[PDB]
PDB file of all heavy atoms in Angstrom:
ATOM      1  N   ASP E 174     148.587  55.002 105.076  1.00  0.00           N
ATOM      2  CA  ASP E 174     149.125  56.256 105.500  1.00  0.00           C
ATOM      3  C   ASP E 174     150.204  56.879 104.676  1.00  0.00           C
ATOM      4  O   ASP E 174     150.376  58.093 104.701  1.00  0.00           O
ATOM      5  CB  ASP E 174     149.766  56.118 106.953  1.00  0.00           C
ATOM      6  CG  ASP E 174     151.096  55.321 106.908  1.00  0.00           C
ATOM      7  OD1 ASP E 174     151.189  54.432 106.068  1.00  0.00           O
ATOM      8  OD2 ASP E 174     152.016  55.754 107.694  1.00  0.00           O
ATOM      9  N   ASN E 175     150.892  56.089 103.795  1.00  0.00           N
ATOM     10  CA  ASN E 175     151.889  56.629 102.907  1.00  0.00           C
ATOM     11  C   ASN E 175     151.614  55.987 101.528  1.00  0.00           C
ATOM     12  O   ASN E 175     151.850  54.778 101.290  1.00  0.00           O
ATOM     13  CB  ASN E 175     153.331  56.303 103.307  1.00  0.00           C
ATOM     14  CG  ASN E 175     154.348  56.820 102.345  1.00  0.00           C
ATOM     15  OD1 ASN E 175     154.174  57.760 101.675  1.00  0.00           O
ATOM     16  ND2 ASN E 175     155.529  56.178 102.385  1.00  0.00           N
ATOM     17  N   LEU E 176     151.106  56.787 100.605  1.00  0.00           N
ATOM     18  CA  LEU E 176     150.642  56.275  99.313  1.00  0.00           C
ATOM     19  C   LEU E 176     151.234  56.991  98.098  1.00  0.00           C
ATOM     20  O   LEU E 176     151.711  58.205  98.271  1.00  0.00           O
ATOM     21  CB  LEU E 176     149.047  56.381  99.195  1.00  0.00           C
ATOM     22  CG  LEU E 176     148.264  55.706 100.366  1.00  0.00           C
ATOM     23  CD1 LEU E 176     146.835  55.907 100.099  1.00  0.00           C
ATOM     24  CD2 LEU E 176     148.609  54.321 100.438  1.00  0.00           C
ATOM     25  N   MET E 177     151.290  56.323  96.971  1.00  0.00           N
ATOM     26  CA  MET E 177     151.802  56.963  95.734  1.00  0.00           C
ATOM     27  C   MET E 177     151.052  56.255  94.613  1.00  0.00           C
ATOM     28  O   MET E 177     151.323  55.101  94.230  1.00  0.00           O
ATOM     29  CB  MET E 177     153.233  56.791  95.558  1.00  0.00           C
ATOM     30  CG  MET E 177     153.873  57.642  94.425  1.00  0.00           C
ATOM     31  SD  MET E 177     153.857  56.758  92.847  1.00  0.00           S
ATOM     32  CE  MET E 177     155.138  55.584  93.099  1.00  0.00           C
ATOM     33  N   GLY E 178     150.101  56.972  94.019  1.00  0.00           N
ATOM     34  CA  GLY E 178     149.259  56.355  92.951  1.00  0.00           C
ATOM     35  C   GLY E 178     148.573  57.413  92.048  1.00  0.00           C
ATOM     36  O   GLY E 178     148.824  58.536  92.285  1.00  0.00           O
ATOM     37  N   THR E 179     147.558  56.936  91.300  1.00  0.00           N
ATOM     38  CA  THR E 179     146.898  57.815  90.343  1.00  0.00           C
ATOM     39  C   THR E 179     145.328  57.657  90.542  1.00  0.00           C
ATOM     40  O   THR E 179     144.874  56.585  90.888  1.00  0.00           O
ATOM     41  CB  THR E 179     147.179  57.459  88.905  1.00  0.00           C
ATOM     42  OG1 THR E 179     146.793  56.191  88.574  1.00  0.00           O
ATOM     43  CG2 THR E 179     148.770  57.547  88.673  1.00  0.00           C
ATOM     44  N   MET E 180     144.668  58.797  90.332  1.00  0.00           N
ATOM     45  CA  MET E 180     143.196  58.785  90.268  1.00  0.00           C
ATOM     46  C   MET E 180     142.759  59.420  88.939  1.00  0.00           C
ATOM     47  O   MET E 180     143.512  60.218  88.461  1.00  0.00           O
ATOM     48  CB  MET E 180     142.597  59.520  91.466  1.00  0.00           C
ATOM     49  CG  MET E 180     142.890  58.981  92.822  1.00  0.00           C
ATOM     50  SD  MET E 180     142.370  60.129  94.083  1.00  0.00           S
ATOM     51  CE  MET E 180     142.991  59.347  95.574  1.00  0.00           C
ATOM     52  N   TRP E 181     141.634  59.026  88.466  1.00  0.00           N
ATOM     53  CA  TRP E 181     141.045  59.669  87.262  1.00  0.00           C
ATOM     54  C   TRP E 181     139.534  59.423  87.223  1.00  0.00           C
ATOM     55  O   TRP E 181     139.123  58.333  87.545  1.00  0.00           O
ATOM     56  CB  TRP E 181     141.784  59.042  86.010  1.00  0.00           C
ATOM     57  CG  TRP E 181     141.320  57.661  85.645  1.00  0.00           C
ATOM     58  CD1 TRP E 181     140.288  57.331  84.784  1.00  0.00           C
ATOM     59  CD2 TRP E 181     141.821  56.474  86.187  1.00  0.00           C
ATOM     60  NE1 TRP E 181     140.214  55.971  84.718  1.00  0.00           N
ATOM     61  CE2 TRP E 181     141.170  55.432  85.566  1.00  0.00           C
ATOM     62  CE3 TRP E 181     142.911  56.196  87.083  1.00  0.00           C
ATOM     63  CZ2 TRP E 181     141.427  54.122  85.870  1.00  0.00           C
ATOM     64  CZ3 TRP E 181     143.177  54.807  87.395  1.00  0.00           C
ATOM     65  CH2 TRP E 181     142.435  53.807  86.749  1.00  0.00           C
ATOM     66  N   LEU E 182     138.827  60.520  86.966  1.00  0.00           N
ATOM     67  CA  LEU E 182     137.459  60.468  86.751  1.00  0.00           C
ATOM     68  C   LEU E 182     137.153  60.667  85.183  1.00  0.00           C
ATOM     69  O   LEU E 182     137.316  61.766  84.688  1.00  0.00           O
ATOM     70  CB  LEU E 182     136.685  61.552  87.506  1.00  0.00           C
ATOM     71  CG  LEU E 182     135.202  61.616  87.109  1.00  0.00           C
ATOM     72  CD1 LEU E 182     134.457  60.428  87.685  1.00  0.00           C
ATOM     73  CD2 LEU E 182     134.543  62.846  87.677  1.00  0.00           C
ATOM     74  N   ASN E 183     136.770  59.531  84.547  1.00  0.00           N
ATOM     75  CA  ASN E 183     136.466  59.600  83.119  1.00  0.00           C
ATOM     76  C   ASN E 183     134.914  59.557  83.004  1.00  0.00           C
ATOM     77  O   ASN E 183     134.285  58.447  83.224  1.00  0.00           O
ATOM     78  CB  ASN E 183     137.112  58.430  82.421  1.00  0.00           C
ATOM     79  CG  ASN E 183     137.027  58.636  80.878  1.00  0.00           C
ATOM     80  OD1 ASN E 183     137.009  59.688  80.304  1.00  0.00           O
ATOM     81  ND2 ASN E 183     137.039  57.456  80.176  1.00  0.00           N
ATOM     82  N   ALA E 184     134.323  60.635  82.510  1.00  0.00           N
ATOM     83  CA  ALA E 184     132.873  60.681  82.334  1.00  0.00           C
ATOM     84  C   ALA E 184     132.588  61.625  81.242  1.00  0.00           C
ATOM     85  O   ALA E 184     133.299  62.645  81.091  1.00  0.00           O
ATOM     86  CB  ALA E 184     132.133  61.089  83.658  1.00  0.00           C
ATOM     87  N   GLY E 185     131.541  61.414  80.573  1.00  0.00           N
ATOM     88  CA  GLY E 185     131.164  62.281  79.448  1.00  0.00           C
ATOM     89  C   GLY E 185     132.256  62.356  78.394  1.00  0.00           C
ATOM     90  O   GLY E 185     132.770  61.395  77.921  1.00  0.00           O
ATOM     91  N   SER E 186     132.648  63.610  78.099  1.00  0.00           N
ATOM     92  CA  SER E 186     133.719  63.861  77.265  1.00  0.00           C
ATOM     93  C   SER E 186     134.925  64.522  77.975  1.00  0.00           C
ATOM     94  O   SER E 186     135.688  65.332  77.393  1.00  0.00           O
ATOM     95  CB  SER E 186     133.338  64.740  76.000  1.00  0.00           C
ATOM     96  OG  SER E 186     134.421  64.893  75.123  1.00  0.00           O
TER      97      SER E 186
END
Side-chain angles (χ1 to χ4, degrees):
Chain E
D174 74 323
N175 182 26
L176 304 181
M177 189 273 286
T179 65
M180 300 172 186
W181 73 96
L182 172 70
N183 191 29
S186 183

